[PDB]
Structures are given as structure tokens and as C-alpha cells.
């Protein structure tokens, strides 16, 4: 009972210590997880901006196709 | 005091066991979190490469516009 409830104390000491760092690593891995979610948005936003600029080249290229074909027809007429 | 400090031992056993797996799941959820951060970079890099190739189409389309308008003017002059 003497050094018996002593071994208990030891395990509990080590334990509280283990539960200590884990409560810190979860701190670290929570701002990271946090920052991971803010970058995902940036990338997403970038992807939207890009598509916006892509929906425009396709547009510009569509009118070019017209501009050029009208010139080509004309020259075939004389 | 006898089987009293016995119940203690049991809780501590189960406990150390619980603190065992958590110290493993945090292992698993740390290489994942790790890999999640290396892919974010790939995607980012991909997004940069893409934009590089996009900044070029817009360029090519800009000169085309010129190429075509000069041909069109000319033909309006005779």
C-alpha cells in the first residue's frame, strides 16, 4: 500500500505530462490546419480569376475567327 | 483501501491505453497533414505555370488583333 500507491503517482505524473504536450501539438496542428484552409481559398480565388481571364481569350479568339473569315471570303469574291 | 486503489489502477490502465492510440492517430494525421501541405504547393505551382501559359495566349491574341486589323485597313484603302 505504501510504495504501491507510489507507482500509481508516477504513472499519473508521466501521464499528465503526456497529456500536456499533446495539448500543445494539437495547438500547433490547429493553426496549421487553419492556415491550410485559408490558402485553399486563395488558390480557389486564383482559379476563379484565371478562368475569368480564360473565358475572355476564348471570346477574343472567337471574334478573330470571324474577323479573318470575313477577310478571306471577301478576297475570294475579288 | 485494498480493492479501492485497485479501481484506480484500472482507470490508469485504460487511460494509458487511450493515450496510446491517440499518440498514434496523431501520427497518422500528421503525415497526412504533411502530404496535404506538399500537394497545396503542387497545385499552386500548377496554377503559376498555367497563368504563364495564359499570359502568353492573351499576348498572341493581342498581336493577332493587330495583324488582322492592318489587313482590314489595307483592303479598305484598295
Amino acid at each position: 500500500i505504501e510504495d504501491k500507491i507510489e507507482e500509481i503517482l508516477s504513472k499519473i505524473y508521466h501521464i499528465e505530462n503526456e497529456i500536456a504536450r499533446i495539448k500543445k501539438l494539437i495547438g500547433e496542428a490547429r493553426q496549421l490546419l487553419s492556415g491550410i484552409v485559408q490558402q485553399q481559398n486563395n488558390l480557389l480565388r486564383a482559379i476563379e480569376a484565371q478562368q475569368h481571364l480564360l473565358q475572355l481569350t476564348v471570346w477574343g479568339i472567337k471574334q478573330l475567327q470571324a474577323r479573318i473569315l470575313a477577310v478571306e471570303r471577301y478576297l475570294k469574291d475579288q | 483501501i485494498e480493492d479501492k486503489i485497485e479501481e484506480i489502477l484500472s482507470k490508469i490502465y485504460h487511460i494509458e491505453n487511450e493515450i496510446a492510440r491517440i499518440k498514434k492517430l496523431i501520427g497518422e494525421a500528421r503525415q497526412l497533414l504533411s502530404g496535404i501541405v506538399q500537394q497545396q504547393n503542387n497545385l499552386l505551382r500548377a496554377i503559376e505555370a498555367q497563368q504563364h501559359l495564359l499570359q502568353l495566349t492573351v499576348w498572341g491574341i493581342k498581336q493577332l488583333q493587330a495583324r488582322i486589323l492592318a489587313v482590314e485597313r489595307y483592303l479598305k484603302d484598295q
Binding site: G35, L43, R45, A49, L53 | -
Partner: peptide, 29 residues
């Protein structure tokens, strides 16, 4: 059609520091 292109350099620049940071922290784990 600075409009979308200057908004992207922004996003990508901004999306460079974070990626640069996230990895730092990930190491300090």
C-alpha cells in the same frame, strides 16, 4: 479584357507566402 491579371499576381504572391509559412509550421510539429 489592371483587371484580372494584376489580381492573379496578387493571389499567387499571396498564395506563395502562405505555402511558405504552412510548411514552416508543419516542420515545427
Amino acid at each position: 479584357x489592371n483587371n484580372y491579371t494584376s489580381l492573379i499576381h496578387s493571389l499567387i504572391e499571396e498564395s506563395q507566402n502562405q505555402q511558405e509559412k504552412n510548411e514552416q509550421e508543419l516542420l515545427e510539429l
